């Protein structure tokens, strides 16, 4: 019965709460105590990943209070396979993302000394907030949540960022709040329409309640209101997770933040996208899913080619990696929402996939940002010679980016394209074609920089590219580890996003269409 | 013989009663001794009238409420609930206003940190002027005239009649006409306010009138019960009743600030006292919101689809006009006067809702609202040009939050609070008057809303921009803490501002109880 | 003579009054502008009283004198303050904020 | 060029509508106090709004 | 409902009196003109109260607002000049002619509003003025507007705090005395 869910986003927030409240020159304490919630975050979830039994029930974990019942909303969480995996991957990601922006706020000045802990708080913040999102079965629960972590990261990116810090920040949090802004919307419809029917004892946001009542049909409604509560949520989530169109807040900000906090903002919160897509659109408006389904492939398909065609025109590094996770957001929205169980197992696991190679690509790429400061692919050349292992980890991120079977994300990008190819062929080749587009926008990429001959000012003078730290060695190696385990044996991840992906399935009445043959 | 309810009529009476007292104290106690007396006999008053108001809701907890003077007065469970409000944003205003000069190395501290000039009568700049700021003299009779509004404002949501919410609206009107002329610094535009305000708050007032004799006329009574049996039973004069209600609304959407009447509140807010700034912004809306609320909910129910699609509009105007207008705004007290008047349109959403939970959404907002507002001017207090000139222009803000990271994070909060992200009251706040308008058939306006609030992020954001994402200029303005009056009026508003909107089920279960009119 | 016809002038009266405080720059001129407005209220008060057979609208005139009393003495003192200051009573003159 | 040019430049075309806009109604404010007199009085939208709002 | 046709000629005279008097306000030139022009003003709607069987209100109308027009006409020769002839010249563009639209049209659209009303029903004040129509108002007064009575108290101590504040000039700012202008080094002589 213990509050293990309730634990889980209480900690980060707590932690946050202590380290923001240091003392100034406790600076390098507060990086070790960062460090020790984020890792007892993790053991959280160990705890809780452990007890989780995909063959049981769909919810477990589930914590039940009274919260604010004049809204109809109450404090209810509950961890299913698809929440789990995704919380595993904020767990794992948070303390290397906290051990790899170790030095980012040290070249800060002003916030009395404590620019150092405002990161460290930050960081924690958006963790803990990810989790309670994550976590959460009240869909009003959820929304304040998914809609608050905005806040921090706005200042994690404002703060602590380049020359355009200011514009991008700005641009970011007005794209992603105008989506929130236009969900809630579609939240208080929903309210609206669940007060205006019987099925509910009066206007609910329980979750499950609602999945329950729309597919016992009970909750019947106009399908034109369903429609439109749909794309509602759906302009939050595609502006938040980026649907090709909506995209664009995303290079900047990516660009100008620190490293540490555009991989936490790209690798783990983006993703809340496509897991409300996954857990709410699907499950709370089924027939209208299946309405826009058509529209919503072809603008991720569209995103996928897109987001790799733009990598590959892209002359900063930061910008290009931005673009990669852009296409391949693409392809977990096309997995999603093609209502296959290969497809949406695929795009589960490929947001755990793309979460740890961007997160280890774009980390790396970071360090050889910092190592000399020109984010232009142009001002490097030859680095493979100077820093062989930073090369080499840099290569390894690059074909998990890739998607190649010796890594991780292939399992994934596989197993979607192969979902697609059951109910949208035309639309799956399309995205195939992304196989070709990342070997070129990342061998290229590695070619301009790491070979060739060394280019001036690489190994010497005040800016020289010096190897892979141990800090940095630690960052690195358990990210390739896990794309490495996943690649060979994604049979645990596997075990546990399916009985979850069987659930949605079953709740949205689609099922994996039979073989041609008989 | 007519039957007092002085226990009903306790907290009005208390206050009006202090506020003789207080011209008393000015009338007969000597000089130096009359600030210690009258911030003594204010501030406990006040207090005093919280503690009647919750007596007052004790008793009323069995009846729905009671008329007090045979009409003209009634105290029910939303006028104890505005009594309250108004009450704790009384005192937290004078204890803004009781703030004193910061003793330098001179005795003549003098009620200055409270932005009043020492003799309001006096040539700005006058040699006369600067002799009264070397004497250290102040104006009390600033104490008496605040308590004045208060009173007003205590009677104008419980006014069952409508000579007695002209009598009210007068009476609250005056005090804040005079305060408006009587600001330390920037005499000028202090002296312009007043004026405007004087002007434009006759006017409204006599529509205000004009439209109290249509109702009257139609009815043939001008208690409001009277007047709401009158149109129901469609005995009086429907174009009467229609035209009245027309006309008072002028004068109430002047007291809130609508768009077709807010053009006095940009020049008013900018030109006021900062302290009397922070108090009008949350009093007066609060008594005006509370005085509609009861002709709309009381007076006027039977003709809302006649005066539905009036508001309808207005709040659409106000919505957009009150923020597109904000966006290009370049100072912080003319923004805040812009958020003020969009915030009146938020509001009037969830008048419209003509339903409880309109009601209930209504007074969480002005509760959760006023003290953020009280606490965002507050703030814009604190912070000083070189010269002592309250600092405003946002150019001059860069980096205000670096140099000062505590008073930069409450006012952020503030701010987010005003655009009303999640987990801030601001949210919570206007959540409920959303899904009031929803539920009421104005899901148009929740939409229109949303947009507004989107395009009113940005200019809440812009600001947070320029505290913190940007070095401090070189000629940075100080903050200067006056006294610990205005750093608790700070504490207790931004507390307030995060708790009810963490945990606003306290004080939201209140705002349901106060659902109904007598 | 049809008894509406007071409400009339009524409606003319405030209409005067409204087109004044909109026309005069005169801060006294614009004072008793609002005062015929008042006034006009008051006349519409007394013809609904006649009608409905009751003091009512009578007693509302008066407490309408007393705002419109105060009304104009608290207009006159912030007028003194800004005469002092400017020298001038005009209202387009206090134009320092705008935009 | 499209993504800097479509999708980038209609996000762009509404800030400068919203900017623009912000702009002309930021000019509405004259500072005359006779001139907010006038939008209030034209306010008078409102009484004929309320007496058409019977038909 | 028609009043006695002496009504109807005391309404005329004095009504046209009243709107001459309103429209001298707005449009006479001189501020004396306009503070004598508001006096008839008052004067007429006094008399037009006393017609509408309203004997004490119009009576207190004609004393009230005497005085009040005697100080605003004080006002007008301190603050604005004795025979100063304004210019009343348009000085916001287009200024004049969108007031003049937007008063006619609210006054065309209050005469709208209020359209034929006294054919419904117009109970005479005799039952209600018979036994005093000033006592009729102290019973109103007292009894059921007795909070709206006390607070007219408050109306008054917060314009008298305001006339104090703003107006009244303390010490500094004192002229000098003709005592204190003979001395000083024999001032005013030497």
């Given at each position: 019965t213990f509050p293990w869910l309730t634990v889980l986003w209480a900690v980060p927030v707590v932690g946050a709460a202590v380290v923001i409240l240091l003392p100034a020159a406790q600076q390098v304490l507060a990086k070790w105590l960062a460090l020790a919630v984020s890792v007892l975050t993790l053991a959280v979830t160990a705890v809780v990943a452990i007890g989780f039994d995909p063959a049981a029930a769909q919810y477990q974990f589930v914590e039940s209070h009274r919260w604010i019942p004049s809204?109809?909303?109450?404090?209810?969480?509950?961890?299913?396979?698809?929440?789990?995996?995704?919380?595993?991957?904020?767990?794992?990601?948070?303390?290397?993302?906290?051990?790899?922006?170790?030095?980012?706020?040290?070249?800060?000045?002003?916030?009395?000394?404590?620019?150092?802990?405002?990161?460290?708080?930050?960081?924690?913040?958006?963790?803990?907030?990810?989790?309670?999102?994550?976590?959460?079965?009240?869909?009003?629960?959820?929304?304040?949540?998914?809609?608050?972590?905005?806040?921090?990261?706005?200042?994690?990116?404002?703060?602590?960022?380049?020359?355009?810090?200011?514009?991008?920040?700005?641009?970011?949090?007005?794209?992603?709040?105008?989506?929130?802004?236009?969900?809630?919307?579609?939240?208080?419809?929903?309210?609206?329409?669940?007060?205006?029917?019987?099925?509910?004892?009066?206007?609910?946001?329980?979750?499950?309640?609602?999945?329950?009542?729309?597919?016992?049909?009970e909750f019947a409604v106009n399908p034109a209101i369903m429609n439109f509560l749909f794309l509602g949520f759906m302009f939050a989530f595609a502006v938040k997770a980026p649907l090709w169109p909506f995209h664009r807040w995303l290079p900047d900000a990516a660009v100008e933040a620190?490293?540490?906090?555009?991989?936490?903002?790209?690798?783990?919160?983006?993703?809340?996208?496509?897991?409300?897509?996954?857990?709410?659109?699907?499950?709370?408006?089924?027939?209208?899913?299946?309405?826009?389904?058509?529209?919503?492939?072809?603008?991720?398909?569209?995103?996928?080619?897109?987001?790799?065609?733009?990598?590959?025109?892209?002359?900063?590094?930061?910008?290009?990696?931005?673009?990669?996770?852009?296409?391949?957001?693409?392809?977990?929205?096309?997995?999603?929402?093609?209502?296959?169980?290969?497809?949406?197992?695929?795009?589960?696991?490929?947001?755990?996939?793309?979460?740890?190679?961007?997160?280890?690509?774009?980390?790396?790429?970071?360090?050889?940002?910092?190592?000399?400061?020109?984010?232009?692919?142009?001002?490097?050349?030859?680095?493979?010679?100077?820093?062989?292992?930073?090369?080499?980890?840099?290569?390894?991120?690059?074909?998990?980016?890739?998607?190649?079977?010796?890594?991780?994300?292939?399992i994934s990008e596989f197993l979607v394209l192969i979902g697609t190819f059951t109910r949208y062929p035309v639309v799956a080749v399309f995205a195939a074609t992304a196989l070709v587009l990342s070997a070129v926008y990342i061998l290229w990429t590695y070619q301009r920089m790491m070979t060739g001959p060394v280019r001036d000012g690489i190994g010497d003078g005040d800016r020289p590219v010096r190897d892979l730290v141990p800090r940095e060695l630690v960052v690195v190696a358990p990210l390739l580890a896990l794309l490495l385990v996943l690649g060979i044996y994604p049979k645990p991840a596997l075990d546990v996003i399916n009985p979850a992906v069987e659930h949605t399935l079953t709740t949205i009445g689609q099922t994996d269409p039979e073989p041609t043959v008989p | 013989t007519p039957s007092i309810e002085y226990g009903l009529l306790s907290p009005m009476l208390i206050v009006?009663?202090?506020?003789?007292?207080?011209?008393?104290?000015?009338?007969?106690?000597?000089?130096?001794?009359?600030?210690?007396?009258?911030?003594?006999?204010?501030?406990?008053?006040?207090?005093?009238?919280?503690?009647?108001?919750?007596?007052?809701?004790?008793?009323?907890?069995?009846?729905?409420?009671?008329?007090?003077?045979?009409?003209?007065?009634?105290?029910?469970?939303?006028?104890?609930?505005?009594?309250?409000?108004?009450?704790?944003?009384?005192?937290?205003?004078?204890?803004?206003?009781?703030?004193?000069?910061?003793?330098?190395?001179?005795?003549?501290?003098?009620?200055?940190?409270?932005?009043?000039?020492?003799?309001?009568?006096?040539?700005?700049?006058?040699?006369?002027?600067?002799?009264?700021?070397?004497?250290?003299?102040?104006?009390?009779?600033?104490?008496?005239?605040?308590?004045?509004?208060?009173?007003?404002?205590?009677?104008?949501?419980?006014?069952?009649?409508?000579?007695?919410?002209?009598?009210?609206?007068?009476?609250?009107?005056?005090?804040?006409?005079?305060?408006?002329?009587?600001?330390?610094?920037?005499?000028?535009?202090?002296?312009?306010?007043?004026?405007?305000?004087?002007?434009?708050?006759?006017?409204?007032?006599?529509?205000?009138?004009?439209?109290?004799?249509?109702?009257?006329?139609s009815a043939g009574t001008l208690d409001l019960s009277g007047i709401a049996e009158s149109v129901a039973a469609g005995s009086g004069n429907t174009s009467l009743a229609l035209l009245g209600v027309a006309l008072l609304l002028v004068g109430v959407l002047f007291k809130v600030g609508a768009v077709p009447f807010?053009?006095?509140?940009?020049?008013?807010?900018?030109?006021?006292?900062?302290?009397?700034?922070?108090?009008?912004?949350?009093?007066?809306?609060?008594?005006?919101?509370?005085?509609?609320?009861?002709?709309?909910?009381?007076?006027?129910?039977?003709?809302?689809?006649?005066?539905?699609?009036?508001?309808?509009?207005?709040?659409?105007?106000?919505?957009?006009?009150?923020?597109?207008?904000?966006?290009?705004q370049t100072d912080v007290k003319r923004m805040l006067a812009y958020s003020a008047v969009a915030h009146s349109g938020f509001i009037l959403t969830g008048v419209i809702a003509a339903n409880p939970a309109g009601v209930s959404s209504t007074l969480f907002y002005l509760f959760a609202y006023g003290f953020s507002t009280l606490g965002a001017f507050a703030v814009v207090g604190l912070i000083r040009n070189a010269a002592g000139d309250e600092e405003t222009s946002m150019a001059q803000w860069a980096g205000l939050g670096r140099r000062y990271p505590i008073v930069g994070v409450v006012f952020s909060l503030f701010l987010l609070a005003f655009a009303g992200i999640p987990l801030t009251s601001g949210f919570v706040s206007k959540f409920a008057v959303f899904k009031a308008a929803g539920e009421g058939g104005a899901?148009?306006?929740?939409?229109?809303?949303?947009?507004?609030?989107?395009?009113?992020?940005?200019?809440?954001?812009?600001?947070?921009?320029?505290?913190?994402?940007?070095?401090?200029?070189?000629?940075?303005?100080?903050?200067?803490?006056?006294?610990?009056?205005?750093?608790?009026?700070?504490?207790?508003?931004?507390?307030?501002?995060?708790?009810?909107?963490?945990?606003?089920?306290?004080?939201?279960?209140?705002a349901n109880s106060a659902e109904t009119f007598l | 003579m049809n008894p509406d016809n007071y409400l009339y002038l009524s409606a003319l009266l405030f209409t005067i009054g409204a087109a004044g405080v909109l026309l005069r720059r005169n801060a006294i001129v614009m004072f008793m502008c609002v005062e015929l407005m008042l006034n006009a209220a008051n006349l519409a008060f007394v013809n609904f009283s006649r009608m409905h057979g009751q003091l009512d609208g009578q007693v509302v005139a008066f407490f309408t004198m007393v705002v419109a009393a105060c009304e104009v003495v608290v207009g006159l003192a912030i007028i003194m303050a800004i005469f002092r200051t400017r020298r001038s009573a005009s209202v387009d003159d206090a134009n320092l904020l705008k935009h | 060029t499209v993504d800097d040019k479509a999708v980038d430049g209609t996000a762009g075309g509404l800030a400068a509508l919203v900017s623009r806009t912000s702009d002309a109604l930021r000019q509405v404010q004259t500072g005359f106090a006779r001139s907010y007199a006038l939008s209030m009085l034209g306010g008078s939208a409102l009484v004929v709004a309320a007496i058409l709002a019977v038909q | 409902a028609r009043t006695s046709t002496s009504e109807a000629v005391v309404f005329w005279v004095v009504g046209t009196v009243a709107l001459v008097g309103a429209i001298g306000v707005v449009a006479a030139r001189k501020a004396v003109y306009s503070a004598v022009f508001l006096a008839c003003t008052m004067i007429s709607l006094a008399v037009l109260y006393i017609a509408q069987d309203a004997p004490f209100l119009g009576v207190v109308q004609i004393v009230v607002y005497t005085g009040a027009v005697m100080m605003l006409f004080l006002f007008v020769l301190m603050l604005i000049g004795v025979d100063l002839t304004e210019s009343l010249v348009e000085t916001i563009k287009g200024h004049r002619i969108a007031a003049l639209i937007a008063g006619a049209g609210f006054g065309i659209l209050v005469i709208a509003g209020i359209g034929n009303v006294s054919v419904a029903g117009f109970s005479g004040l005799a039952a209600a003025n018979s036994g005093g129509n000033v006592e009729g108002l102290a019973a109103l007064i007292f009894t059921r507007y007795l909070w709206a009575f006390e607070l007219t108290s408050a109306l008054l101590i917060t314009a008298a705090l305001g006339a104090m504040v703003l107006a009244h000039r303390e010490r500094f700012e004192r002229r000098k005395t003709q005592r204190e202008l003979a001395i000083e080094r024999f001032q005013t002589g030497g």
């Open positions: 809204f109809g909303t109450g404090y209810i969480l509950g961890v299913d396979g698809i929440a789990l995996a995704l919380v595993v991957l904020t767990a794992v990601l948070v303390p290397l993302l906290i051990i790899a922006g170790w030095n980012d706020a040290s070249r800060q000045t002003g916030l009395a000394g404590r620019s150092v802990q405002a990161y460290l708080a930050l960081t924690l913040a958006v963790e803990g907030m990810v989790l309670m999102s994550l976590v959460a079965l009240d869909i009003l629960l959820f929304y304040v949540f998914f809609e608050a972590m905005l806040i921090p990261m706005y200042f994690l990116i404002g703060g602590f960022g380049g020359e355009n810090r200011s514009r991008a920040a700005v641009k970011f949090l007005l794209y992603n709040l105008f989506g929130g802004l236009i969900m809630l919307a579609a939240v208080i419809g929903l309210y609206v329409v669940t007060a205006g029917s019987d099925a509910f004892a009066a206007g609910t946001f329980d979750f499950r309640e609602i999945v329950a009542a729309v597919s016992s049909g620190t490293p540490a906090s555009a991989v936490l903002m790209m690798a783990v919160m983006d993703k809340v996208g496509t897991f409300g897509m996954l857990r709410y659109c699907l499950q709370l408006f089924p027939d209208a899913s299946t309405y826009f389904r058509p529209v919503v492939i072809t603008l991720a398909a569209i995103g996928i080619v897109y987001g790799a065609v733009l990598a590959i025109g892209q002359t900063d590094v930061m910008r290009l990696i931005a673009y990669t996770s852009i296409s391949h957001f693409g392809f977990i929205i096309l997995g999603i929402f093609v209502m296959t169980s290969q497809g949406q197992s695929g795009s589960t696991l490929y947001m755990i996939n793309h979460g740890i190679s961007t997160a280890a690509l774009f980390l790396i790429a970071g360090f050889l940002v910092s190592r000399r400061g020109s984010r232009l692919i142009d001002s490097y050349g030859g680095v493979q010679k100077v820093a062989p292992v930073l090369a080499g980890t840099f290569l390894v991120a690059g074909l998990a980016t890739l998607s190649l079977p010796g890594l991780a994300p292939f | 009006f009663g202090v506020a003789i007292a207080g011209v008393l104290i000015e009338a007969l106690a000597p000089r130096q001794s009359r600030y210690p007396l009258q911030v003594t006999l204010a501030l406990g008053g006040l207090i005093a009238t919280v503690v009647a108001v919750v007596f007052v809701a004790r008793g009323l907890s069995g009846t729905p409420g009671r008329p007090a003077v045979l009409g003209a007065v009634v105290l029910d469970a939303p006028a104890v609930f505005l009594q309250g409000t108004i009450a704790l944003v009384g005192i937290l205003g004078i204890m803004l206003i009781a703030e004193r000069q910061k003793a330098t190395v001179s005795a003549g501290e003098a009620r200055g940190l409270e932005d009043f000039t020492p003799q309001a009568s006096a040539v700005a700049g006058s040699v006369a002027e600067q002799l009264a700021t070397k004497t250290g003299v102040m104006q009390t009779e600033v104490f008496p005239l605040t308590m004045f509004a208060i009173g007003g404002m205590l009677l104008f949501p419980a006014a069952d009649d409508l000579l007695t919410m002209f009598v009210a609206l007068e009476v609250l009107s005056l005090p804040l006409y005079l305060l408006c002329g009587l600001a330390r610094r920037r005499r000028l535009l202090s002296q312009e306010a007043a004026l405007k305000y004087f002007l434009l708050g006759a006017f409204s007032s006599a529509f205000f009138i004009y439209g109290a004799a249509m109702l009257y006329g807010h053009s006095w509140i940009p020049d008013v807010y900018q030109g006021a006292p900062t302290s009397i700034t922070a108090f009008m912004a949350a009093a007066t809306k609060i008594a005006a919101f509370g005085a509609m609320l009861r002709i709309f909910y009381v007076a006027v129910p039977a003709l809302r689809d006649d005066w539905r699609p009036v508001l309808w509009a207005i709040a659409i105007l106000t919505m957009v006009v009150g923020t597109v207008t904000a966006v290009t899901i148009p306006l929740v939409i229109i809303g949303v947009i507004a609030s989107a395009v009113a992020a940005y200019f809440y954001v812009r600001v947070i921009v320029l505290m913190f994402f940007t070095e401090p200029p070189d000629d940075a303005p100080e903050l200067v803490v006056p006294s610990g009056l205005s750093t608790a009026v700070v504490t207790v508003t931004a507390a307030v501002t995060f708790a009810l909107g963490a945990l606003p089920q306290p004080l939201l279960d209140l | - | - | -």
